[PDB]
């Protein structure tokens, strides 16, 4: 690819769960009926060109398209196939994520990067097994 | 037509008498509900 | 003869109503065979 490109509003994004390789992507999810017309594009690995992406839009009128996304900027996300926003509904007396037309803000936050690399050093979230020096 | 559908879909506020999620957005329920208002009474529900 | 004098009673009803339009009617001259078995298992048995 290019190698550590930036991220801009309006770009066609691709996500991926970290520890499982199920690319969250445009799929034919036609199952959930809490709202009775809404989708839930879950997890499956069918990275197939057109039905691959989500797409960013800014939260409110403070940053327009073409601008570089900064840390902490709340966002709006939308499919290419369904065109639904990343809806945050309430199914039955509880939370339920769906895809609908009532948009919802969606913040982000940093976790790590490529320069923030281990090469033997410690990083949070890493599993490990403890050792004594003498007894092992 | 594409922009019309994309604009209708953000606010599909055709709220009929009673259905799930939206008001109506479903034809047989609202139509059979309104034929009771139409057939025996007048245009109104309570009318002679 | 049988089920169309019956449907002619229904046609006189729709004539006196002033030309309604409601689905619950099929006369026998052009009746699909889904509602004809209850008539068939006597109308063929008389002929047997």
């Amino acid at each position: 690819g290019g190698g550590h490109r930036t991220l801009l509003y309006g770009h066609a994004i691709l996500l991926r769960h970290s520890y499982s390789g199920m690319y969250l992507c445009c799929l034919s999810t036609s199952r959930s009926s809490t709202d009775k017309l809404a989708f839930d594009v879950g997890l499956q690995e069918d990275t197939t060109g057109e039905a691959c992406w989500w797409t960013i839009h800014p939260a409110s009128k403070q940053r327009s398209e073409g601008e570089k996304v900064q840390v902490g900027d709340d966002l709006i996300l939308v499919s290419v196939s369904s065109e639904r926003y990343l809806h945050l509904s309430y199914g039955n007396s509880s939370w339920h994520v769906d895809a609908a037309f009532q948009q919802t803000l969606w913040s982000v936050a940093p976790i790590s990067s490529g320069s923030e690399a281990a090469q033997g050093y410690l990083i949070g979230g890493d599993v490990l097994r403890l050792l004594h020096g003498h007894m092992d | 037509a594409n922009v019309v559908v994309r604009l209708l879909i953000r606010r599909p506020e055709c709220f009929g008498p009673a259905l799930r999620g939206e008001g109506g957005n479903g034809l047989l329920a609202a139509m059979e509900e309104a034929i009771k208002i139409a057939e025996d009474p007048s245009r109104d529900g309570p009318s002679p | 003869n049988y089920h169309n004098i019956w449907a002619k009673k229904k046609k006189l009803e729709l004539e006196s109503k002033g030309g309604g339009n409601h689905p619950l009617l099929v006369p026998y001259d052009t009746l699909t065979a889904k509602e004809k078995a209850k008539d068939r298992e006597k109308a063929q048995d008389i002929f047997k």
Partner: peptide, 26 residues
């Protein structure tokens, strides 16, 4: 085959479109 399948699926999601056969007599 030309992006009309999106709007056709959106239309198809509103099935009641299969069930309007009842309304065609009612």
């Amino acid at each position: 085959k030309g992006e009309a399948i999106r709007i056709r699926s959106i239309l198809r999601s509103l099935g009641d479109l299969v069930g309007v056969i009842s309304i065609a007599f009612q």
